[PDB]
Design a protein around this ligand. Structure first.
Ligand SMILES: [Zn+2]
Length: 46
């Protein structure tokens, strides 16, 4: 039965940088900001 588990996952959304946990999906795509990440320059806001 379910006895031994390597905590595969505790949340549907986890940051692949700091391994954070959020309740909502967006909260994740938004937080990622704090991190630079490997992405090219996009359409600046304004
Ligand atoms: Zn993070």
């Amino acid at each position: 039965g379910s006895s031994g588990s390597s905590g595969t996952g505790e949340k549907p959304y986890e940051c692949d940088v700091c391994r954070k946990a959020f309740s909502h999906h967006a909260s994740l795509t938004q937080h990622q900001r704090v991190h630079s990440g490997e992405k090219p320059s996009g359409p600046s806001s304004g």
